[PDB]
Amino acid sequence: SADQPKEEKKECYYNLNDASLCDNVLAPNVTKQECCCTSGAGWGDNCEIFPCPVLGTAEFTEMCPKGKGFVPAGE
């Protein structure tokens, strides 16, 4: 539950954040799975974001088991 992307909605980040500088600028609040699966850059709580996705890698593959382009914007 806690040791895996699940039941946890936050602000998406297409730009970045570096989990310390917070760099959203146009990003809806959703579940890392959706935001990242869209192909963003980071998902978290302003400044506390996780570099996502990574495409063809562990991270993404997790937040997006279907394919890149599920949610709006990055669809």
Q: According to the entry, how was the structure determined?
A: NMR
Expressed as residue numbers, the domain containing 38 is 1-75
42/54 Cα distance (integer angstroms):
10
64/5 Cα distance (integer angstroms):
11
Q: What angle do CA 30, 73, 54 make, to 5 degrees?
A: 70
CATH assignment of the domain containing 57: 3.90.290.10
19/47 Cα distance (integer angstroms):
5
Three-class DSSP category at 30? strand
State the CB neighbour count (10 A cutoff) for residue 74. Answer: 18
